[PDB]
Design an enzyme around this catalytic site. Structure first.
Site, PDB file in Angstrom:
ATOM      1  N   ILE B  19       0.817  -1.205   0.000  1.00  0.00           N
ATOM      2  CA  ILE B  19       0.000   0.000   0.000  1.00  0.00           C
ATOM      3  C   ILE B  19       0.852   1.258   0.000  1.00  0.00           C
ATOM      4  O   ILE B  19       0.354   2.307  -0.438  1.00  0.00           O
ATOM      5  CB  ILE B  19      -0.968   0.021   1.210  1.00  0.00           C
ATOM      6  CG1 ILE B  19      -0.167  -0.081   2.520  1.00  0.00           C
ATOM      7  CG2 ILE B  19      -2.028  -1.042   1.063  1.00  0.00           C
ATOM      8  CD1 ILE B  19      -1.023  -0.143   3.770  1.00  0.00           C
ATOM      9  N   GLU B  21       5.191   3.045   0.495  1.00  0.00           N
ATOM     10  CA  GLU B  21       6.619   2.984   0.722  1.00  0.00           C
ATOM     11  C   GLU B  21       6.929   3.743   1.997  1.00  0.00           C
ATOM     12  O   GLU B  21       6.311   4.779   2.275  1.00  0.00           O
ATOM     13  CB  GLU B  21       7.421   3.606  -0.414  1.00  0.00           C
ATOM     14  CG  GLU B  21       7.606   2.716  -1.606  1.00  0.00           C
ATOM     15  CD  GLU B  21       8.410   3.407  -2.675  1.00  0.00           C
ATOM     16  OE1 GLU B  21       8.376   4.651  -2.765  1.00  0.00           O
ATOM     17  OE2 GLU B  21       9.138   2.695  -3.388  1.00  0.00           O
ATOM     18  N   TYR B  24      11.335   4.198   6.678  1.00  0.00           N
ATOM     19  CA  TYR B  24      12.218   3.164   7.184  1.00  0.00           C
ATOM     20  C   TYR B  24      11.955   1.773   6.616  1.00  0.00           C
ATOM     21  O   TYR B  24      12.890   0.972   6.613  1.00  0.00           O
ATOM     22  CB  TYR B  24      12.130   3.075   8.718  1.00  0.00           C
ATOM     23  CG  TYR B  24      10.732   3.201   9.308  1.00  0.00           C
ATOM     24  CD1 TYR B  24      10.128   4.436   9.528  1.00  0.00           C
ATOM     25  CD2 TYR B  24      10.036   2.060   9.656  1.00  0.00           C
ATOM     26  CE1 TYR B  24       8.854   4.520  10.077  1.00  0.00           C
ATOM     27  CE2 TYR B  24       8.774   2.120  10.198  1.00  0.00           C
ATOM     28  CZ  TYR B  24       8.184   3.355  10.411  1.00  0.00           C
ATOM     29  OH  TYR B  24       6.918   3.412  10.956  1.00  0.00           O
ATOM     30  N   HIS B 104      -9.087   4.604   2.553  1.00  0.00           N
ATOM     31  CA  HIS B 104      -8.542   5.594   1.630  1.00  0.00           C
ATOM     32  C   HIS B 104      -7.762   6.630   2.442  1.00  0.00           C
ATOM     33  O   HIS B 104      -7.938   6.757   3.661  1.00  0.00           O
ATOM     34  CB  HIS B 104      -9.617   6.329   0.781  1.00  0.00           C
ATOM     35  CG  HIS B 104     -10.554   5.414   0.054  1.00  0.00           C
ATOM     36  ND1 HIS B 104     -10.128   4.350  -0.710  1.00  0.00           N
ATOM     37  CD2 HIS B 104     -11.903   5.445  -0.066  1.00  0.00           C
ATOM     38  CE1 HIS B 104     -11.179   3.728  -1.219  1.00  0.00           C
ATOM     39  NE2 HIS B 104     -12.267   4.383  -0.857  1.00  0.00           N
ATOM     40  N   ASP B 105      -6.930   7.417   1.748  1.00  0.00           N
ATOM     41  CA  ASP B 105      -6.240   8.557   2.351  1.00  0.00           C
ATOM     42  C   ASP B 105      -6.617   9.840   1.618  1.00  0.00           C
ATOM     43  O   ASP B 105      -6.962   9.819   0.434  1.00  0.00           O
ATOM     44  CB  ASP B 105      -4.723   8.362   2.357  1.00  0.00           C
ATOM     45  CG  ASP B 105      -4.130   8.256   0.954  1.00  0.00           C
ATOM     46  OD1 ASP B 105      -4.903   8.233  -0.025  1.00  0.00           O
ATOM     47  OD2 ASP B 105      -2.884   8.212   0.830  1.00  0.00           O
ATOM     48  N   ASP B 145       3.887  16.716  11.856  1.00  0.00           N
ATOM     49  CA  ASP B 145       3.923  16.409  10.433  1.00  0.00           C
ATOM     50  C   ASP B 145       2.517  16.236   9.862  1.00  0.00           C
ATOM     51  O   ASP B 145       2.189  15.215   9.251  1.00  0.00           O
ATOM     52  CB  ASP B 145       4.772  15.171  10.154  1.00  0.00           C
ATOM     53  CG  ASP B 145       5.101  15.030   8.666  1.00  0.00           C
ATOM     54  OD1 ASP B 145       4.926  16.031   7.929  1.00  0.00           O
ATOM     55  OD2 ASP B 145       5.509  13.937   8.225  1.00  0.00           O
TER      56      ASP B 145
HETATM   57  C1  LIG Z   1       5.849   7.103  -2.434  1.00  0.00           C
HETATM   58  O1  LIG Z   1       4.920   7.571  -1.462  1.00  0.00           O
HETATM   59  C2  LIG Z   1       3.626   7.763  -1.853  1.00  0.00           C
HETATM   60  C3  LIG Z   1       3.197   8.830  -2.627  1.00  0.00           C
HETATM   61  C4  LIG Z   1       1.861   8.936  -2.966  1.00  0.00           C
HETATM   62  C5  LIG Z   1       0.957   7.994  -2.538  1.00  0.00           C
HETATM   63  C6  LIG Z   1       1.387   6.933  -1.761  1.00  0.00           C
HETATM   64  C7  LIG Z   1       2.720   6.796  -1.399  1.00  0.00           C
HETATM   65  C8  LIG Z   1       3.192   5.635  -0.552  1.00  0.00           C
HETATM   66  C9  LIG Z   1       3.148   5.930   0.934  1.00  0.00           C
HETATM   67  N1  LIG Z   1       1.791   5.945   1.460  1.00  0.00           N
HETATM   68  C10 LIG Z   1       1.390   5.149   2.444  1.00  0.00           C
HETATM   69  O2  LIG Z   1       2.143   4.360   3.015  1.00  0.00           O
HETATM   70  C11 LIG Z   1      -0.065   5.284   2.881  1.00  0.00           C
HETATM   71  N2  LIG Z   1      -0.226   5.386   4.314  1.00  0.00           N
HETATM   72  C12 LIG Z   1      -1.130   4.671   5.001  1.00  0.00           C
HETATM   73  N3  LIG Z   1      -2.312   4.411   4.401  1.00  0.00           N
HETATM   74  C13 LIG Z   1      -3.237   3.661   5.032  1.00  0.00           C
HETATM   75  N4  LIG Z   1      -4.422   3.447   4.437  1.00  0.00           N
HETATM   76  C14 LIG Z   1      -4.899   4.222   3.308  1.00  0.00           C
HETATM   77  C15 LIG Z   1      -4.384   3.735   1.975  1.00  0.00           C
HETATM   78  C16 LIG Z   1      -3.261   4.303   1.399  1.00  0.00           C
HETATM   79  C17 LIG Z   1      -2.792   3.864   0.175  1.00  0.00           C
HETATM   80  C18 LIG Z   1      -3.432   2.835  -0.508  1.00  0.00           C
HETATM   81  C19 LIG Z   1      -2.916   2.354  -1.816  1.00  0.00           C
HETATM   82  C20 LIG Z   1      -3.238   1.108  -2.319  1.00  0.00           C
HETATM   83  C21 LIG Z   1      -2.720   0.710  -3.534  1.00  0.00           C
HETATM   84  C22 LIG Z   1      -1.895   1.564  -4.222  1.00  0.00           C
HETATM   85  C23 LIG Z   1      -1.616   2.789  -3.663  1.00  0.00           C
HETATM   86  N5  LIG Z   1      -2.106   3.195  -2.483  1.00  0.00           N
HETATM   87  C24 LIG Z   1      -4.558   2.265   0.075  1.00  0.00           C
HETATM   88  C25 LIG Z   1      -5.026   2.712   1.296  1.00  0.00           C
HETATM   89  C26 LIG Z   1      -2.940   3.162   6.314  1.00  0.00           C
HETATM   90  N6  LIG Z   1      -3.648   2.381   7.219  1.00  0.00           N
HETATM   91  C27 LIG Z   1      -2.820   2.248   8.230  1.00  0.00           C
HETATM   92  N7  LIG Z   1      -1.624   2.884   8.052  1.00  0.00           N
HETATM   93  C28 LIG Z   1      -0.538   2.902   9.029  1.00  0.00           C
HETATM   94  C29 LIG Z   1       0.469   1.807   8.730  1.00  0.00           C
HETATM   95  C30 LIG Z   1       0.118   4.264   9.138  1.00  0.00           C
HETATM   96  C31 LIG Z   1      -1.692   3.479   6.811  1.00  0.00           C
HETATM   97  N8  LIG Z   1      -0.748   4.214   6.209  1.00  0.00           N
END
Ligand SMILES: COc1ccccc1CCNC(=O)CNc1nc(NCc2ccc(-c3ccccn3)cc2)c2ncn(C(C)C)c2n1
EC number: 2.7.11.22
Lengths: 826, 326, 248
Positions: B19, B21, B24, B104-105, B145
């Site tokens: 989901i 990157e 860490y 979703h985010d 943040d």
């Molecule tokens: C390179 O960088 C980025 C730049 C833009 C977008 C994303 C990233 C990566 C870092 N983003 C993240 O890691 C997102 N954090 C996130 N989203 C959650 N749930 C929403 C969510 C987010 C993304 C997707 C998803 C699925 C498939 C493809 C893409 N996205 C689905 C649900 C979630 N629940 C629990 N936690 C804890 C571990 C903190 C979560 N952390």
């Protein structure tokens, strides 16, 4: 990094807007037709139109209006692009030399504002004192038309009414006055304001607010003899002017929504109205003169004239001739007669201009075994639905197959010498309890026909009530002969069953070639469908036989054959099915980290998934284990409209914001994270909505064709009929062509003085980045049309590299040869 | 027991995909084999062995086991890779922080442009966020943040704060020097742009106000790539930093160094005239230059805009449907 | 939800160290040395009193789940202090802790760290985190000594003598298993009680209930004097055995 090249094979054909006036000369009658990014200028004759000039603009034409300020001999042209580039243009001709003058220009975008639901609206004062722009909710922007405002500087007036439907400047007012329809929780209303350039605010308007129809859509500004305005709705047309109020609600217009209007008589006596079913009406203003000498509006009347193409813009030209600008179908010139013909129609078609319409899907097939490849496109919607067969021969030859219903997906089955086409037609709930079709169409005029009797969802017990007059879609699979293009067979899917995907292939050890259709049960209550079918048909001896059906718990949005197996996307899941010796589909492996798997593409054992919001994912089938594995995801967020695989490392995608991007495997095996990260290495604002990516080329291949610098061939279709082509380049050729673009942009004069670099900048409402990895071939191909002085100016101090010639100067004749080869890829 | 963390293995989860990157280590989506609940396992890699277990994770393990709130994300457990048998020195296996999977985010819902927010929906989004922030601020913790990608959203309309990697305790009595420039430039407060290093909990408030405006415009309010450029954009809307509005601005390190082109006047109410009156006041108070005059989280919750919002009537936002894809 | 970090005195007869043949006196000597090592190393590095205490609590808890004979006392101590620094936001580099540990330890003692001291420590961090069950937040008697002392009103100089003497008793109690027997709140009261008896002060008067002879109750509910005496006895015993005598 990745290097790619994009060229237009067919320019946008859909008509986005059309105006008339006196633009080229104070004497001629002009017709300006706007296609996406393209402006066409015509002169009206007694037989038709004489073309005079066409220009491209580095922007989508959002506003197009002609006006004549005091002191000018002839009309000036205002254009505002969708990225908010504004300019005022003038036509100038010196004997044989025709050019377009940029008189004023600037970008009117606000740092903070909410884009409106009903889109950019631009209007100009009858005294040409100012340009009104409705760009953001709650704001009205005024560009005053003073001689000194060469930069089109403007100010905003706070507008209390946040949700405006339509606005027009009124005729016959003591001060600049706007009349508009707006929506708040209490319904829709019509209201007026006065615009004060001195105070830079609104003042109380000439007449009071009136409550109007809930679906009041358009504001017609009536000319000086009557004054006031007309408000067009779904059921009624009303006239408002201070104390005067009229309303006509003829039952004929309730049947179809009215979308366009024009004035036939400059005095406002007669207007033209069109609706989404193609009908053309005449709106009549019946005058009554009082002994006072004043002229008042007595009554309104609506009269049905005939049928035209579903028209985005109407413009009356002269005599009986009307230009019908169509976005969903072919545009037209039609003549209105005083006497009806024997069928009761007053409308008779004169000329038909080709509009590839919305290209929902398309495939490339070599029908004549020529090694060339012809493009068969699903084009148009509703009555304008058509199949268009396109071949190269210097112009493109296009054949039209009328369907009179909406084509959705197309696939070629060579074994059967025919095409499979998914289609949908509109029926309306009728007094029998069933439905009735508004007109006969391909699915009804098939030679043989069948209807699905499946009992999969027959248990029902879920109530769906029907009201008389409501529309429904009826989806069908059409079998169409590849030579005659005659509808051989029509299969009608289940009630409330929508056909979403179509493939033609062999599976497993089964020698039969099948049509496979993926469907979804759609009910207005559901946000997302929860039922579906994958159906295996065999076309044999003039009949379609149902071989098998597989039930799914979602919508089969996209299917693709995968090495003898069937790869289908059912909502969130991406599934791989095997075809057994019992002729039934069998699940093998699944993937579930998908929001909605809208698009699928395969190369080898690699699969490219296009998600609604989470962009592209490169799945891989691992045969040793019998399951999928995530190779890499594009972590950046982009909404997709179509995807394609370029090669084993590069992947092409299209954004709903008219943007293209290329993702690549990061190819650095240091950390597992790097491989699982796809880096968007290409960014490009296409300016068109890509619906279908398809490998192939239309160029004739005699095997003698010199190997071009470009490698690969992806054609793409768009909503506005534009057909384009994407291809890859070597690092050296890219640097050469890119360096040349930067030289060309300094030399070539842009209409409206729009910077090319800005136009192609990747642009989302929230992100804007410079283009990368893409060569605008349409810019490169313009080198051949610039004058000799300019050509030599471009090649000054240009050096080659990465080849036999590490440093090699370019001459104007050398580059003419290079571009000429680049024009031979289409 | 449920409390013995670090021993249960990650075998207990069926990994669904990736989901996101991680700063860490990479985050995977997953299903619990025993209960079927969907979780999100963050990978914590000690194999670098530069400074051992990341401090960023240590802050998320320290703070999130203390913070209990409907609007703050939940760390359910910590699980490990199959550890090497009786050889801890050879063992380089990693640890996973199990969290609830939020559907979703905010970044993705607004960036795809598919989300449409009504006024009442914004009220429910903001009321939850402020309630979460207030809980955290009352416990004297600072998120440091706040970002649109850090506001997770379930389809139900429940909002949860998420990335506590840069969070630290705030002491009112002792102004200990902390790190600097903690929030991403677009959502960064004016004081940190000028480098206070002794920051107040009001830094998080500025960000949330930036989000409030972005929910109405559907476009981030202050988008710039350079710290001075951000100060200019903020200065244009909120007014130039000046001693009258910010008596202590002269004490900030870069006040003389970093200057806007002009001493711009405040235009917030004008440029946000389309925003409802109840909300516009909240924005003016949340986007106040002086951290001492900037409203608190509790003050935002005792609001005409948010006070009478009922958390029972969640009212889900207009999330994408199949017709919306059409 | 959260783990239990408190044992009964009788239970300390059954630590891994005891059952591997270590006698009670040795395990308590080993605990004082390891705790004082942690205290001395961190003090040389300039660490906050909370950081020193957090490391010591990790240390004490560790050897309730593990043996002393199989796990060295000074490596563990260094590892605890290293992690404590990150938990309490007073971080130090592992190399610097080793440097100081070498300065303070003789050659025999530093032999525990083996051929690669930093590696032996950094490797242990895994076991430590799993052992303390990732329950990193720790409260210490210090904060309660001050929270409670702030509510005393009277002679400024008699209360400041009470606090410092009690504060010294807190530092001394870190060498013992009291951290494993009684919550920090009770410890803070016990040291206020001990300093009060020795300074011949009657703390009841400084409270808001001058007549509530059981003043500990308005701070810590359900604390019998029997508890406070057991704690005082254990603290006073350290002074009896050592050459150090009551500060007064
Ligand atoms: C390179 O960088 C980025 C730049 C833009 C977008 C994303 C990233 C990566 C870092 N983003 C993240 O890691 C997102 N954090 C996130 N989203 C959650 N749930 C929403 C969510 C987010 C993304 C997707 C998803 C699925 C498939 C493809 C893409 N996205 C689905 C649900 C979630 N629940 C629990 N936690 C804890 C571990 C903190 C979560 N952390």
């Amino acid at each position: 990094m990745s290097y790619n090249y994009v060229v237009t094979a067919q320019k946008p054909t859909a008509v986005n807007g059309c105006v008339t006036g006196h633009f080229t000369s104070a004497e001629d009658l002009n017709l300006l037709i706007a296609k996406n990014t393209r402006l066409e200028i015509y002169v009206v004759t007694a037989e038709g139109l004489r073309p005079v000039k066409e220009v491209g603009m580095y922007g989508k034409i959002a506003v197009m209006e002609l006006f004549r300020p005091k002191g000018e001999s002839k009309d000036l042209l205002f254009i505002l692009t969708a990225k908010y580039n504004a300019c005022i243009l003038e036509y100038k001709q010196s004997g044989e030399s025709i050019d377009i003058i940029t008189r004023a220009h600037g970008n009117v975008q606000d740092r903070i504002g909410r884009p409106s639901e009903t889109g950019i609206i631009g209007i100009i004062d009858p005294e040409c004192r100012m340009i009104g722009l409705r760009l953001y909710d709650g704001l009205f922007k005024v560009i005053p038309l003073d001689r000194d405002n060469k930069e089109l500087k403007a100010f905003n007036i706070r507008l209390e009414e946040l949700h405006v439907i339509d606005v027009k400047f009124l005729y016959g007012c003591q001060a600049p006055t706007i009349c508009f329809v707006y929506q708040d929780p209490q319904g829709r209303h019509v209201k007026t304001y006065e615009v004060s350039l001195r105070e830079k605010e609104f003042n109380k308007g000439p007449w009071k607010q009136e409550n109007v129809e809930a679906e009041a859509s358009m504001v017609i500004a009536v000319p000086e003899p009557f004054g006031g305005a007309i408000i067009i709705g779904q059921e009624s047309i009303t006239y408002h002017n201070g104390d005067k109020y009229l309303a006509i609600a003829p039952p004929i217009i309730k049947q179809s929504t009215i979308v366009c209007h024009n004035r036939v008589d400059p005095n406002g006596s007669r207007y033209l109205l069109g609706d989404m079913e193609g009908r053309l009406f005449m709106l009549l203003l019946e005058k009554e003169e009082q002994m006072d000498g004043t002229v008042t509006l007595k009554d309104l009347r609506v009269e049905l004239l005939g049928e035209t193409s579903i028209a985005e813009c109407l413009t009356y030209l002269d005599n009986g001739v009307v230009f019908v600008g169509s976005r969903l179908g072919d545009s037209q010139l039609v003549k209105l007669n005083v006497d009806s013909n024997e069928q009761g129609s007053y409308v008779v078609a004169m000329e038909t201009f080709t509009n590839l319409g919305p290209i929902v899907d398309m495939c490339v097939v070599d029908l004549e075994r020529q090694g060339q490849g012809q493009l068969v496109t699903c084009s148009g919607a509703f009555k304008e639905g058509s199949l268009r067969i396109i071949r190269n021969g210097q112009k493109l030859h296009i054949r039209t197959v009328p369907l009179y219903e909406s084509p959705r997906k197309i696939c070629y089955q060579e074994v059967s010498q025919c095409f499979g086409v998914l289609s949908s037609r509109i029926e309306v709930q009728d007094t029998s309890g069933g439905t009735t079709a508004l007109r006969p169409s391909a699915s009804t005029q098939a030679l043989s026909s069948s209807v699905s009797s499946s009992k999969l969802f027959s248990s029902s017990t879920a109530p769906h009530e029907t009201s008389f007059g409501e529309e429904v879609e009826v989806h069908n699979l059409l079998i169409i002969d590849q030579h005659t293009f005659e509808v051989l067979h029509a299969h009608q899917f289940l009630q409330n069953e929508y056909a979403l995907s179509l493939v033609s292939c062999k599976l497993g050890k089964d020698p039969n070639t099948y049509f496979i259709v993926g469907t979804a049960m759609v009910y207005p209550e559901e946000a997302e469908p929860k039922q579906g079918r994958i159906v295996v048909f065999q076309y044999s001896d003039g009949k379609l036989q149902t071989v098998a059906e597989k039930e799914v718990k979602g919508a089969v949005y996209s299917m693709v054959e995968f090495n003898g197996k069937l790869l289908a996307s059912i909502n969130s899941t991406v599934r791989l099915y095997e075809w057994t010796t019992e002729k039934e589909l069998r699940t093998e492996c699944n993937h579930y980290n998908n929001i909605m798997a809208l698009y699928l593409k395969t190369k080898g054992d690699f699969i490219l998934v296009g998600d609604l919001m989470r962009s592209v994912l490169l799945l891989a089938y691992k045969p040793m284990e019998g399951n999928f594995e995530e190779i890499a995801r594009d972590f950046n967020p982009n909404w997709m409209s179509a995807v394609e695989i370029l090669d084993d490392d590069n992947f092409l995608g299209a954004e709903n914001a008219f943007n293209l991007f290329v993702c690549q495997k990061d190819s650095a095996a240091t950390t597992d994270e790097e491989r699982q990260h796809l880096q968007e290495v290409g960014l490009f604002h296409l300016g068109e909505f890509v619906n279908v990516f398809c490998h192939g080329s239309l160029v004739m291949q005699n095997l003698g064709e010199t190997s071009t610098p470009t490698q690969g061939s992806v054609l793409f279709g768009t909503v506005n009929g534009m057909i384009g082509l994407v291809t890859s380049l070597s690092e050296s050729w890219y640097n050469l062509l890119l360096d040349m673009q930067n030289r060309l942009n300094k030399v070539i004069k842009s209409v409206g003085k729009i910077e090319h670099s800005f136009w192609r900048s990747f642009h989302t409402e929230r992100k804007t980045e410079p283009a990368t990895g893409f060569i605008d071939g349409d810019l490169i191909e313009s080198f051949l049309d610039i004058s000799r002085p300019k050509m030599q100016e471009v090649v000054a101090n240009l050096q080659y590299d990465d080849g036999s010639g590490m440093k090699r100067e370019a001459t104007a004749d050398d580059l003419i040869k290079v571009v000429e080869e680049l024009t031979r890829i289409h | 027991t449920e409390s013995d963390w670090g021993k249960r293995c990650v075998d207990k989860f069926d990994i669904i995909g990736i989901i996101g990157e991680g700063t860490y280590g990479q985050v995977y989506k997953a299903k619990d084999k025993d209960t079927g609940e969907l979780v999100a396992l963050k990978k914590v890699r000690l194999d670098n062995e530069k400074e051992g277990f990341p401090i960023t994770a240590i802050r998320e393990i320290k703070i999130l086991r203390q913070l209990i709130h409907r609007s703050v994300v939940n760390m359910k457990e910590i699980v490990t890779d199959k550890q090497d048998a009786l050889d801890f020195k050879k063992d380089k296996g990693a640890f996973y922080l199990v969290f609830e999977y939020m559907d979703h985010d905010l970044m993705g819902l607004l960036e795809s442009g598919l989300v449409h927010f009504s006024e009442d929906h914004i009220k429910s989004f903001m009321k939850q966020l402020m309630e979460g922030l207030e809980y955290c601020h009352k416990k004297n913790f600072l998120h440091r943040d706040i970002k649109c990608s850090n506001i997770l959203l379930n389809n139900s309309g429940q909002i949860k704060l998420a990335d506590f990697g840069l969070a630290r305790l705030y002491n009112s009595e002792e102004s200990r020097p902390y790190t600097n420039k903690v929030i991403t430039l677009w959502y960064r407060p004016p004081e940190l742009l000028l480098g206070e290093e002794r920051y107040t909990p009001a830094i998080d408030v500025w960000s949330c106000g930036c989000i409030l405006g972005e929910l109405f415009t559907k476009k981030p309010i202050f988008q710039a790539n350079l710290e001075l450029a951000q100060l200019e954009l903020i200065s244009r809307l909120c007014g130039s930093p000046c001693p009258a509005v910010w008596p202590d601005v002269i004490r900030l390190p870069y006040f003389n160094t970093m200057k806007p082109k002009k001493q711009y006047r405040r235009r917030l109410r004008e440029e946000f005239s389309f925003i409802p009156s109840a909300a516009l006041d909240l924005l003016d108070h949340m986007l106040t230059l002086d951290p001492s005059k900037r409203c608190t989280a509790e003050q935002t919750l005792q609001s005409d805009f948010l006070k009478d919002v009922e958390l029972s009537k969640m009212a889900p936002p207009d999330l994408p449907h199949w017709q919306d894809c059409h | 939800t959260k783990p239990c970090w408190y044992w009964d005195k009788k239970d300390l007869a059954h630590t891994p160290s005891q059952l591997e043949g270590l006698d009670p006196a040795t395990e308590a000597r080993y605990r004082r040395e390891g705790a004082r090592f942690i205290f001395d190393v961190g003090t040389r590095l300039g660490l906050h009193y909370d950081t020193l205490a957090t490391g010591i609590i990790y240390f004490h808890r560790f050897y309730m789940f593990h043996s002393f004979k199989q796990f060295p006392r000074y490596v563990t101590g260094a590892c605890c202090l290293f992690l404590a620094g990150k938990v309490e936001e007073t971080p130090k580099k592992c190399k610097d802790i080793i440097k100081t540990a070498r300065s303070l330890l003789n050659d025999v003692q530093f032999g525990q760290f083996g051929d690669d001291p930093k590696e032996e420590v950094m490797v242990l961090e895994r076991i430590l985190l799993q052992t303390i069950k990732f329950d990193l937040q720790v409260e210490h008697p210090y904060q309660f000594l001050l929270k409670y002392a702030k509510q005393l009103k009277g002679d400024k100089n008699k209360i400041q003598k009470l606090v410092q003497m009690a504060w010294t008793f807190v530092n001394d109690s870190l060498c013992t298993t009291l951290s494993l027997q009684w919550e920090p709140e009770i410890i803070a009261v016990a040291v206020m009680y001990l300093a009060g008896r020795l300074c011949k002060f009657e703390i009841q008067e400084w409270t808001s209930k001058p007549m509530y002879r059981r003043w500990w109750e308005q701070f810590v509910q359900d604390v019998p004097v029997d508890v406070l005496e057991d704690i005082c006895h254990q603290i006073l015993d350290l002074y009896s055995q050592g050459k150090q005598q009551m500060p007064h």
